[PDB]
């Protein structure tokens, strides 16, 4: 028209190859069609270093203010990255920071095409990973205890009452880690999962190791059971779907023999691992949608994958790459859809439906980046480099006048 | 006559796997060997009598004699304490034993020519090299019902206290602390780099060192140091690589790989990933599992669970198609070593057999339900466990 927006999208930029691709998507796919309103936050590793990570806090506060963010893939610096970039320090994960500030559950679902069959034989139906976005080792405290010692966790409440437990007592160099979660957050996580399963009419599976983690993981098991029995058991029976709880090593065994079609609830760490397992097995890592659904009414759409470092070095050498931009696209269309829905601007939502359908129909016709070409049946017609792929969807958008 | 020095140590299970220990003893080893066993009933009812002492006694016996054999046990949750006659939710006997010995648990699929793996690209076996020590298997935990300041605290022998804050919260919270030692991580690294030269397989290792900058990153640092300084050149010379990446990345790669590497694993990942690997290759029962201590003791075990759900179902009319192949290969691995150290080559050449026969059997189309569901061409007969052992005797 161009399509009009009422509220800005909060836009969080990122690193490496996905940072290169981000402007191509906007320039070729969105800006010809939508008069795009965003509040831009650069969460590139250099901007985070330049502002001592403050820009991450700003972006998260902007998501809370406007309601919906879209996030590009970022580097979390370790010792290698600090060296590579000249960093002041090993900054904390911007994802960990944003998710802590929002709370919620990250729903991760493969983006399926008809010409790619899953790596796992039995899998017919999509598997959705519902990842708790809050706590555990994404807000860790750690110590390199270079002389060993008595290793403990200590809680001191607001009246000054302390409780202490000994992890171990050793007399040699050791490492110590502590994590937390909250009762309230685990509750929001169970509810978000139970709500998602009902809405989508799929079973819900959850698993921890509550036989080893007798108070921590067992707390998650307890809360899911009580919330389920007190609030969802009957809606579940009415909708004809089931909650299934088991141990985590066991759930992954069953997952290898399952036909899929369930919501796999996961603790924060497990959901990181298993969401990559699931994306990879269904297709490739780029073929996955990811949305953080917060209990406070915010949404953050993101890619689940990383910044494709190896393709980036190729790009810096002046090479074209066939980097799959699909998860970045779905982040944009996932965010713009939610924005238009919140705003009562359904032509924005309509555009999003189209750009998603065009992406799928392009790949299914045999026009695709190299990750998908390696695995499609029948063989691709054309193995497009990133820019060509994005131009091809651009062309299809135009051939509707959109 | 029957074959014959030192008692291989013996720990015994719970539920359905206990029920199948006699049958392997009686039918597959007793008629053909002098069976010296130091018996420790690690059943849930026994540990709840002896206050779990039987587990410690039991693990000292393995320290004392040298080589153990363990049946799948149960580890108790509040559910198991409502269920059984139980004083406490006792700690995992596996955790207990593996704390006391240390090591790396190597876990490999028991492969068989008529089962296609679940993962289409897997053409070679994948070994899991699971660190047996520390992390959350030796945890401290508090339910902070009034919230507060949540911390880890280290006091060294000279009274130096170091504190780090996990979070301060104004609401109920759960709190967990865990540890490892630099020494045990070093041993685990070396254990894995050796397995890889001694099997001439590549080594893959993975943690989340970008999130856990002092804990996981220490593992990462220790692997790359020990490999730069002790194995870089032994690896180029053997034609093999050490590969390090992020845990989420490695598992993404595992689904597109052809297999045939050593997957080095932290303690918790090794637990999850060996079940994934076992199950994708065939079934959970189709897996070997040996604790190799750096001290160095051995513990040859199941890996899978006591088969609850299958136990009741035996508590009526004996519907038993349970796959014993893993209980069996714990013995054939354990004697293959109990007699490898007892000098006698008259036990390596027998063991080489009790297993090779188990295979030939399955490969010829006589096998348990789990296997019959997934083999091709279709199974000739679906034998039940009781009748599966029989077939493996007796010349
Ligand atoms: Mg991830
Ligand atoms: Mg990457
Ligand atoms: Mg396990």
Short mmCIF file of C-alpha atoms in Angstrom, two decimals, chain B residues 31 78 110-111 187 211 231 234-235 241 269 321 325 356:
data_model
loop_
_atom_site.label_atom_id
_atom_site.label_comp_id
_atom_site.label_asym_id
_atom_site.label_seq_id
_atom_site.Cartn_x
_atom_site.Cartn_y
_atom_site.Cartn_z
CA UNK B 31 27.17 -74.66 33.74
CA UNK B 78 9.02 -38.93 47.17
CA UNK B 110 25.61 -53.46 20.90
CA UNK B 111 25.23 -53.51 17.15
CA UNK B 187 41.63 -37.91 34.02
CA UNK B 211 27.18 -19.29 29.61
CA UNK B 231 48.11 -35.68 22.15
CA UNK B 234 49.79 -38.60 18.54
CA UNK B 235 46.51 -37.66 16.87
CA UNK B 241 41.00 -35.18 15.26
CA UNK B 269 24.99 -34.90 29.19
CA UNK B 321 9.58 -59.98 26.34
CA UNK B 325 21.43 -58.52 26.06
CA UNK B 356 29.21 -63.48 19.41
#
